[PDB]
Amino acid sequence: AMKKVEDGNILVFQVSMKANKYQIKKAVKELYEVDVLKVNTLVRPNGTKKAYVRLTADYDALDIANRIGY
Amino acid sequence: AREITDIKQFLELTRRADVKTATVKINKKLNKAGKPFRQTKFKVRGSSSLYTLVINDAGKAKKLIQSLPPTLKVNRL
Amino acid sequence: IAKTFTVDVSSPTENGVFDPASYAKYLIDHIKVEGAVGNLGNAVTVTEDGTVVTVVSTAKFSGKYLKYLTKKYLKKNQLRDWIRFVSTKTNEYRLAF
C-alpha cells in the first residue's frame, strides 16, 4: 500500500462496509481537504472493505500521508 | 483517431478553446520511387478526438510551425 | 543493378593472425554463380587493399552467402573462437577480434 503513495499518488484506506464510492469521495475531501480523481473499492477476504483513492495532480499523496501521521 | 487534410481547418482546431496540447512527429520514410524524404505529422488533442495532419513537404512544414498560436503547448518528438 | 559488399578486416590483421590476401583468394574459387564455381564471367569481382575486402556482383549474391563463405573460411583455418563476422550497417561488415 505504501508503494502506491509516492508512486501512484494513491491513498489506501479501510472503510465501512456500508459506504459506497459517493460517500468515500465526500468523506476524504472533508477530512483531509484534498481533491479525489476516482475511487476503486473491493471487499477483502477477511470481511472488510478497502478503497483505492487517487488524488488529482494538484495534490501529492506523500505530503498528505505525512500530515496524517503515517 | 481522425485525420484532416485541409490546412485552413487545422488552424481553426488549434484555437477551439478546448485544445491545450499538441505534438509534432517526424518520420523518415521513402517516397514512391525515390530516396527517403521527411514527413511531419501535426497532432491536435481535442476533448473527444485526436486530429492528425500529415504534410510531406518540408518547406511547407516549417511555415506551419511558425504560424501555430503561442498559447498552445507543443510537444516535440 | 550491381550491389557492393565490404568486409573490414583491420582488427584481425593488426594482430597478425589473419591474411586479407588469402581470404580474398578464397572468395574467387568458392563463389557459385548460376550453378557451380568458376563462373565469374564479368559478374563477380572481389578486390582487396590490405584493410578492406570489397565485393561487387551483378548476379545472385547476398549478405547471408558472404557470411556463410566467411564462416567456412574461418572454420577451415580454426579462427572461429577469436574472429566473428558482424554487420555494422546495411551491406557493410567487419571482423571482430
Binding site: 471487499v43 477476504p45 477477511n46 470481511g47 | - | -
Partner: protein
C-alpha cells in the same frame, strides 16, 4: 467457485478468522484449563458444508 454470493463470502470470512491457535498469554491466567483450540479446521480434512 469464483462466482459467489455475498452471503457465502461473508460466511467464509468468519470461518477464516476463527481458524487460529489460542494466544499463549491466555494459558497463564488464574484457573485456566484450556490448552489447545478444539475447534481447529483444515480445508482438506473437514468440510464446511454450506
Amino acid at each position: 467457485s469464483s462466482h459467489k454470493t455475498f452471503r457465502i463470502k461473508r460466511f467464509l470470512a468468519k470461518k477464516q478468522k476463527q481458524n487460529r491457535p489460542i494466544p499463549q498469554w491466555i494459558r497463564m491466567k488464574t484457573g485456566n484449563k484450556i490448552r489447545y483450540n478444539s475447534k481447529r479446521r483444515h480445508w482438506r480434512r473437514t468440510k464446511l458444508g454450506l
